[PDB]
Ligand binder design. Sequence first.
Ligand code: ATP
Ligand code: MG
Lengths: 48, 498
Amino acid sequence: MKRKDVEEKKQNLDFYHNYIDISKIKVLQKLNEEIASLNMLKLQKGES
Amino acid sequence: SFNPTNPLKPIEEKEFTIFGEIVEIRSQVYKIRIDKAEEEVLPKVIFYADVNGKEIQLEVADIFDKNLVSTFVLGNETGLKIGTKVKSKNQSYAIKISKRLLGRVIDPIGKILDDSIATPVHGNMYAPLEMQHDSEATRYVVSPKNAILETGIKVIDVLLPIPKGGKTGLLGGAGVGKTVIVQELINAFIKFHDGVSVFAGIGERIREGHELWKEAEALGFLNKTAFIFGQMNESPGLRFRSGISGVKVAEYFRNNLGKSVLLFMDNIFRYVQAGSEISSLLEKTPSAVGYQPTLFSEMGQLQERINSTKDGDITSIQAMYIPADDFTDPAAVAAFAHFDSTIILSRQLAAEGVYPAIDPLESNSKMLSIKYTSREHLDIAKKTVQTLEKTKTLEDIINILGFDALSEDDKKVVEVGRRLKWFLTQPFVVAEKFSGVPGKFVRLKDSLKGIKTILDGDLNHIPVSYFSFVGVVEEIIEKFNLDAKKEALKNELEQNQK
Ligand SMILES: Nc1ncnc2c1ncn2[C@@H]1O[C@H](COP(=O)(O)OP(=O)(O)OP(=O)(O)O)[C@@H](O)[C@H]1O
Ligand SMILES: [Mg+2]
């Protein structure tokens, strides 16, 4: 139980905290792609 | 026959020449003033006293003046008062050693501990504290380690090989499995050893010593083993001398009879603890964490006598206790410097059910060299440890970010790591009482083959649960095949019924 280990743990936690924001950005982009594809699928289904 | 070149010499016959009486008392520490003496008193000599025919020995620690000394008791102090008469031969404590010690259970000062009638042990008087050799250079004529013992335990045989003629240590907290591993090593080493064995219990349970003595009687290796027991119920003065007496007995059996000695010490932390208590009772300035100033010197004074010469080998297997699971403890740091092989036990692994609870990511062995093993063994061990480290790193990512964040490589790495971790567990022969699973003995090449097969990814289809507590990988394959066959037969039967 040394300050070095606590600093390592806190830096890992902060890195994960940033990475979760990055994952949120990626998931939002994939959601936008999926919605854009689904609109076209809906129009194709109506035409069919 | 065998011609000793540095044999032990029995003590010199003497008459009581120093006389005095106790002028200060305390718990375990007494001050003696000398009235009559034909010679000046020396450090570490023994003063004897008698109370109702019971003999009490006190070792000298400090010499304040020409007539005043401080002492600590070796044994029970019940009976000592102010004015008790004490006499001394100006010699340190001695025990009777001979070939008749094998099969006998004694304590550090030679009290009989295996029968009530106290059957005497014949031999000569040797002083464990007094070590005699021609010169300092004579201490540097030692043989190099050139062999590795096989234990039958997969993890120890593969990742942490145990030297022959060296020192191995088993470190861990309370109740993690040090004594079980020591007993398994005793079972797997004695009765096949070209020599004798010496066990030294230092501040351990009485029940464990009784169990080990009974097991030695039952399995037939009692007559090849010498037992010394200063246990946790004894005074600090006795727990401080158990290791010295055990080392002296091993040195007698090596130097004087040319035999290879298997030395087991448990627990080697209690020696340091007793020395610390004695130092605290003599009112000396403590070191860090309240230890004695002479901690490293005290550890070295015992550890340096366990050496291998041309007369024979002394192989030491020692259990080290970690107080409060603190591996930065000064005693642990002092002990780390002497172990050729270090095996560190984990409480979390034991909680998960991994047995033996050996942490390969914290342990190390100096026998993993090209001088002692083959290239293939080194490569397999390095790959295993690397895979376990990578798996441990990836488990945090799995725990926090979920499982789908990993790639295909990371998932395969985790699967291989889990299979490797659960394959290293093994049922111990001595551990049949705890569960009932029969013990297994796996030789080195079978362990290497199994680990190579698991590393290659051949068994990723078999569920992890099958890998725990087996012998060779063929047992895992057989269990998987039988379970699949039973499932297939049940499915065929139910489809026939429908
Ligand atoms: N190989 C094993 N197989 C099964 N159970 C085990 C094994 N090793 C240890 N255990 C379990 O752990 C318990 C403690 O083991 P052991 O007596 O060896 O511990 P220890 O480290 O010597 O403890 P202490 O600090 O009290 O001296 C055993 O009673 C048993 O339940
Ligand atoms: Mg124990």
